Ligand SMILES: CC[C@@H](C)n1ncn(-c2ccc(N3CCN(c4ccc(OC[C@H]5CO[C@](Cn6cncn6)(c6ccc(Cl)cc6Cl)O5)cc4)CC3)cc2)c1=O
């Protein structure tokens with residue numbers, strides 16, 4: 467028995483491999499991990515304690531392209547092939563999707579030790595907002611921060627915000643070049659241009675106050691734009707690749723946080739701390755339960771986080787509302803009648819209380835959030851091995867879980883004629899969200915314990931949104947004034963555009979233009995201006 471000869475030929479063979487043409491070796495450097503990846507999947511496909519894994523040809527990339535461009539179609543095909551639980555590789559990571567209310571339950575109500583949101587999100591958010599807040603702190607710090615922010619989002623705060631938001635909308639109609647209602651009776655706008663502006667203007671004025679709003683009338687506004695461009699999906703993958711807009715992002719957050727800090731310190735020095743805005747509120751109520759106070763820098767950062775949170779979700783949403791109503795003059799008509807009924811033909815001034823008596827307007831917001839969940843995919847990093855009840859499936863630590871209530875929003879099974887815009891599906895159910903059972907408190911107020919609602923635009927569990935009532939307040943005022951003031955429709959041959967799933971939120975694909983017309987051509991908006 468002499469296999470020794472063969473053992474020699476192993477060594478000889480490696481040496482020959484080392485000698486190969488400098489190009490052929492490169493080609494091997496491609497084909498070998500290519501083949502390994504394929505064999506690996508086939509091997510993986512034999513495991514019974516793993517959810518099925520979506521096949522992919524290109525290593526590391528995985529299903530990035532198809533998921534990135536059309537995640538709901540991707541999910542539907544996957545669901546057809548595998549059912550509700552399945553995995554797919556995404557830019558070096560394994561994402562395990564759990565579709566439907568069970569998935570909502572599995573991810574949003576996961577134990578604190580099983581999953582981490584901050585491990586999923588911090589490397590995008592921390593550079594944008596700053597240190598020590600949101601996802602750059604332990605979850606218990608986040609919980610209290612959310613408690614602090616909620617303390618400025620009370621009914622009394624909303625009562626005070628409504629005239630301020632209304633004033634901003636009217637000023638925008640008066641002064642913005644997109645409108646100029648005192649000099650033009652009709653015009654064309656791109657809602658992806660107007661809505662982000664109206665959003666930052668109304669959220670600035672109400673949450674941050676008059677000074678900070680006033681700063682947006684200057685080239686300081688460009689910092690917000692710079693900051694905004696650091697809030698993009700690529701920063702999930704590549705958080706710190708050296709380029710110009712990364713530096714501009716960092717500079718922006720320093721500059722903006724600096725401006726907030728400047729105002730905070732001035733207010734403290736002057737004993738000018740009232741109950742006007744979120745800044746006042748946080749200055750008065752910013753101490754953790756262990757007695758550590760948030761620093762002025764952390765307060766500033768938290769303000770950035772909060773304004774950024776409401777910015778894209780709300781802007782995308784009012785864009786979609788305008789776009790759906792543009793081909794539904796019947797709905798604009800019905801909403802107008804409700805406006806005339808509730809505001810006494812317009813001789814009642816809009817208030818927060820009267821907003822609560824506009825069920826069809828609120829249903830319109832609700833239905834838009836059903837058809838256009840701003841965030842098509844929410845993530846968590848799995849921290850401990852997770853057994854999927856009731857299967858043999860185990861989700862290993864190091865995986866990520868992906869939940870998508872927005873996908874369920876669009877399933878006929880849970881919403882008949884799901885692809886039809888029908889505000890009347892919410893008749894006698896016009897509230898932003900409804901807890902169908904018992905409640906629980908994670909630190910920022912009692913919220914629904916079960917997260918099995920097929921409708922979940924604000925998510926649930928410990929990471930649940932706290933801006934929902936502010937968003938309804940802002941969208942409410944905004945659409946109330948739009949409706950009473952204007953009618954609008956599409957250019958010929960235009961209709962509702964498809965979503966752009968590649969950005970941070972599911973905003974419409976641009977340009978998304980509508981034509982407005984004044985209901986009262988001779989109506990003038992008062993106040994001083996220089997145009
Ligand atoms: C480039 C190649 C191409 C083919 N490709 N390949 C893949 N993709 C892709 C994949 C996925 C996605 N995304 C879209 C964005 N999405 C996402 C974005 C934000 C997000 O936020 C969750 C947390 C953090 O931010 C906020 C958002 N928010 C909540 N309420 C208001 N805003 C948040 C929470 C708290 C605070 Cl204070 C601020 C903020 Cl912003 O919630 C979660 C998911 C993930 C999937 C985009 C592109 C591509 O485009």
Ligand code: HEM
Pocket residue numbers: 583608612772773775776777779780783835839840841844845922923924925926928929930931932933934936937
């Ligand atoms: C209608 C618009 C909005 C929608 C659809 C929306 C959606 C959501 C969703 C789905 C979550 C859960 C995130 C997750 O589980 O990963 C969330 C969380 C949150 N939202 Fe919003 N949101 C909206 C507006 C706002 C506004 C106006 C604010 C600020 C006032 C805000 C601040 C937050 C915060 C602070 C969180 C906490 C995230 C966490 O705890 O990890 N949102 N939002």
